Design a protein around this ligand. Structure first.
Ligand SMILES: [Cu+]
Ligand SMILES: [Cu+]
Ligand SMILES: [Cu+]
Ligand SMILES: [Cu+]
Ligand SMILES: [Cu+]
Ligand SMILES: [Cu+]
Ligand SMILES: [Cu+]
Ligand SMILES: [Cu+]
Ligand SMILES: [Cu+]
Ligand SMILES: [Cu+]
Lengths: 112, 220, 382, 382, 112
């Protein structure tokens, strides 16, 4: 969290859409890892009895490296990390900023 | 964000394989904790799969996470498999637990520690929500068909374990001798109708619970 | 395993397991071992354990490494819960059949509904063989011999794999199209009602038709293949027969009982009165699975667990024979490493520092009196 | 009515009603019928029925077609709940007075607080007359004879008709004006405060004045007309006197009991030991209101209900006299249509397939032993 | 429900006020019948133990034959039929559309 937090992008107001899409993909890889750790920590080892790191690091990466999440603390994405559908809706809307949503909205007549 | 135009559907399909990973393995591990904490044991042993308590409390307690994932995905993406992915995740996550921890280390036999069957009720919920696009018709018809098909859908597995045996002077079933040997530490339609009537209320509450969890809000 | 973390006053004051036997200590696969004995339900039952009105005679083992063939309280088969009475002695027998090879620590225990397990003494029993040779045959009232190790296993596998395949086909019919965000963009920006075709509604009503149809035809086929079914048989059996015992001709009063903190011994002052017709000597003190014996009076020949057997752990200050009518006040020390190993010294952390136990008196012939003693236990530091 | 839908193992294993008498089977209005008998509380009481610590001796009837004059458990009047003990036999007597003409099916039952009703055998009793002749006089401690069929009836009618008329006058003062939607339009479009006059507030404070005034003057008049009142008398009476019985000189052990599915008979293997001083024969098996009798040993002369009386329903394979000290293992068949009519064959749907009952042994003189038997009941299909 | 549902008035946007008042009176007769069936089904025969048809048909008739109810599904009038004060407030406001509420608001100075 130290190596992630202090390395926030300062001029986040003027970012390239391609490098923002690279960071969106990196944040989605972070969320995939958090989902895998949610599965492993809960669905296996509570029933052998029968991700705080990964989630707060993903929250830091979305808050720092990514626009659309720098609008303040996200409420479903806070509940997800201190407690995911609202998280994925916000992540998808973060993906739909550069071109993918005025470019993908022209592929709906050629590629569904 | 992308240069080409056929690249744009190449990119999003990739997202289609990483979000389907983020949905699934979060609604596996949280549905599994809910199912274990709220029931208790209650599904680990075949001699606990009776006609009164099991048939009541299993489809009532387990309609919660389908009711809240279905309201998200159908409103938001028109994706009608909100209940099916929840029951398939719960079934996979507990079949792994029965095969690798119950039978794998404790060596309980798998015909004694099998889990319940949940897929027909979720397909009823999903097809009723997709064909009639309202949640009130789902919360009545599909949520009573969730709780009315549980024991008819589990009876092809449960029925051979109910065969009567005269065991040492007493009358047992095969599931009773299974629970006795393997050492650990008109009731059915009335129970099915009570579970079907309460599943309406639990679906109605958890629909709005998953609506509140479907919010996209920001803070200070 | 599991008994050393229970409270020491709860172990001393719930169930006293004595007269225990094990028919074998080394056994093969598909061979039986019998555990007989008596258990006394203590009169001063603790208020933090619920009363044994719903109790189950269980076996402690690390999973089914033996299968329980039979259990008897009295001489009556007890496959259900029972109601035991406080103050009564019962006679139990457990027949086990060996399933997994290894070296296993087998306990006799009692599961009480609002008090958890009461674990008795455990013996290491060695199982030799291979688990592949284990058979569990039973014969049903419909005239069919099945093997419970593999019965209804392929049927369970079939009916779970079938419905998992149907659910995967339902998800995969909808996951061959772009799943996320042409549809998120299509719902809010207008056209949410062209994301579902008429062919999609045909396939959904086909799924809803041949899910209910498959369920009712499968239920009909199960009812036709298994016409005779009974419910699951449950219910607490009250009417257990207690072991009817003669009243003891020895009366013991505990003046004071102390123990050093720290140490491995407890001490007692006892006033013993022989109301019998023969001279007695004290030969054994049993407190919580641990047997402290006097070597001059009593030797163990039932093969008791050696970690729980103090074969010279009872030191009576005057253990001459006690004539009939004679009274004697005497100092009795119970000293063994099992005081510290089994954590009976952890009664210093208990909110009730009282002990209970059994004393065993032996005549010159060999007739045995079982006296039940109970007193406050006072620690000693200085 | 109502007993055939209860569980058969619950009927067999809660209360055993025997020695039952009915003083009349045809009675007139204002005439009494007495029902005496004994009931035994079974030792293996089911866990799904709550224990009879709060029980009420009731009569089953389709409404008050008789009135209960008296009830006695022991010889002590029991108008409240009682505490019965498990294992005890009690002696009851119920005195009823005929109220409605017809032909009524009267049961003796026991209402247990957490277990509902336990219904005994019912007799058809015919009441002849007209209900207009029924009198129910009682004399109060204030020296007044009232008739409980019509006492306080005009007073109740007056005080409900009065307050209904006052409420109708309150609604009808406001329902002589346009009720709905000049007022809906008048409230939201401004003038909500001219819908209520000052005369309306005068009438409302008149209603509020002479409602409280009428209530307190009516309470004062009731306290002046009835100066002596007591609370309602309630409370569970513990201290019922059990019937003290001699121990039976016959011991019966049930080896196995079976019944065919489907059929109308159950079977038993019994080891019978005569510890008496006279030769016994088995004459009756009572299981759940049904009496299976052996005609050579016992004939019924108390007028038992014929739908529940198998007068030749007991087939003992060797029913010669059993000498004192002699033991005999014997096969006993209990066969009647009442097995199928009263749905005792519906123990196949029960989660506890065990039966209980009473056997009756008769000496050459006529001295009767009542032995209580209890065993698992195993169905037979093939 | 078949004879009521498919017989919806197509041009409900241009209706005569008199025929709309006739349909309002017919819908109120339907609601009177639903009240009578609510009384009979509940206040008598639950206490002998001591209207789904009529209510959904009235909901269909209000949704189809009547303006002021064609604004979508009415929430109190849905709770009333799948579970009445909000129903009667909406029914009264349905009555107050043609003239009765600018004509009845001139009878308040002559006939209270
Ligand atoms: Cu589970
Ligand atoms: Cu599990
Ligand atoms: Cu004891
Ligand atoms: Cu003695
Ligand atoms: Cu002696
Ligand atoms: Cu001994
Ligand atoms: Cu009895
Ligand atoms: Cu006798
Ligand atoms: Cu006799
Ligand atoms: Cu008799």
């Amino acid at each position: 969290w130290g190596y992630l937090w202090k390395t926030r992008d300062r001029n986040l107001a003027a970012l390239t859409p391609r490098e923002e899409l690279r960071r969106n993909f990196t944040h989605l890889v972070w969320l995939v890892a958090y989902a895998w750790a949610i599965y492993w920590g809960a669905s296996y080892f509570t029933e052998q009895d029968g991700y705080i790191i990964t989630g707060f690091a993903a929250f830091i990466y979305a808050k720092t490296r990514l626009p659309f999440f720098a609008k303040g603390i996200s409420l479903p994405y806070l509940v997800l990390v201190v407690g995911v559908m609202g998280t994925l809706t916000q992540t998808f809307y973060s993906f739909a900023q550069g071109g993918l949503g005025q470019s993908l909205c022209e592929a709906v007549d050629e590629g569904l | 964000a992308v240069r080409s135009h056929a690249e744009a559907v190449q990119v999003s399909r990739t997202i289609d394989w990483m979000a389907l990973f983020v949905v699934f393995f979060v609604i596996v591990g949280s549905y599994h904790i809910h199912a274990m904490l709220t029931m208790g044991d209650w599904d680990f042993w075949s001699d606990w799969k009776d006609r009164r308590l099991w048939v009541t409390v299993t489809p009532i307690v387990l309609v919660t996470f389908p009711a809240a994932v279905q309201s998200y995905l159908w409103e938001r993406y028109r994706l009608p498999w909100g209940a099916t992915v929840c029951v398939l995740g719960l079934l996979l996550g507990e079949w792994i637990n029965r095969y690798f921890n119950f039978w794998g280390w404790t060596y309980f036999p798998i015909n004694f520690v099998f889990p319940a069957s949940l897929v027909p009720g979720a397909i009823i919920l999903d097809t009723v929500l997709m064909l009639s696009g309202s949640y009130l018709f789902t919360a009545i018809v599909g949520a009573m068909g969730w709780g009315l098909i549980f024991y008819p859908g589990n009876w092809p597995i449960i029925a051979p374990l109910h065969v009567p045996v005269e065991y040492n002077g007493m009358l047992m079933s095969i599931a009773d001798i299974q629970g006795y040997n393997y050492v650990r530490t008109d009731v059915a339609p009335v129970s099915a109708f009570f579970s079907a009537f309460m599943s309406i209320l639990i679906y109605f509450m958890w629909h709005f619970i998953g609506r509140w969890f479907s919010n996209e809000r920001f803070l200070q | 395993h599991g008994e050393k973390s229970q409270a020491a006053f709860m172990r001393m004051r719930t169930i006293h397991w004595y007269d225990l036997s094990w028919s074998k200590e080394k056994v093969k696969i598909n061979e039986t071992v019998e555990i007989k004995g008596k258990f006394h339900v203590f009169e001063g039952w603790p208020e933090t354990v619920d009363e044994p009105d719903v109790a189950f005679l269980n076996v402690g083992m690390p999973g089914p490494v033996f299968i329980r063939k039979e259990s008897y309280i009295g001489g009556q088969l007890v496959p259900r819960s029972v109601r035991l009475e406080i103050g009564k002695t019962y006679d139990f027998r457990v027949v086990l059949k060996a399933r997994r090879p290894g070296d296993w620590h087998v306990h006799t225990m009692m599961n009480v509904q609002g008090g958890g397990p009461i674990i008795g003494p455990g013996k290491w029993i060695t199982v030799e063989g291979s688990m592949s040779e284990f058979r569990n045959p039973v014969t049903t009232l419909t005239g069919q011999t099945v093997d419970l190790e593999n019965y209804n296993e392929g049927n369970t596998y079939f009916w779970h794999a079938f419905w998992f395949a149907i659910g995967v086909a339902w998800i995969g019919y909808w996951s061959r199209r772009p799943i996320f965000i042409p549809r998120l963009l299509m719902v809010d920006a207008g056209r949410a009602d062209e994301l579902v075709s008429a062919t999609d509604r045909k396939v959904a009503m086909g799924f809803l038709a041949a899910t209910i149809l498959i369920v009712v035809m499968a239920m009909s086929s199960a009812n036709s293949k298994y016409p005779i079914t009974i419910p699951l048989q449950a219910g607490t059996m009250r009417g257990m027969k207690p072991l009817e015992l003669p009243a003891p001709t020895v009366s013991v009063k505990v003046e004071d009982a102390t123990y050093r903190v720290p140490g491995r011994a407890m001490r007692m002052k006892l006033t013993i009165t022989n109301h019998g017709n023969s001279p007695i000597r004290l030969g054994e003190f049993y407190t919580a699975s641990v047997r402290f014996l006097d070597s001059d009076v009593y030797k163990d020949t039932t093969g008791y667990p050696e970690d729980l057997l103090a074969e010279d752990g009872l030191s009576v200050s005057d253990n001459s024979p006690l004539a009939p009518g004679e009274t004697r006040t005497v100092d009795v020390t119970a000293s063994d490493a099992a005081w510290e190993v089994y954590r009976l010294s952890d009664i210093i952390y208990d909110p009730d520092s009282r002990f209970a136990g059994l004393l065993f008196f032996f005549d010159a012939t060999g007739n045995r009196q079982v006296v039940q003693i109970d007193a406050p236990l006072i620690p000693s530091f200085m």
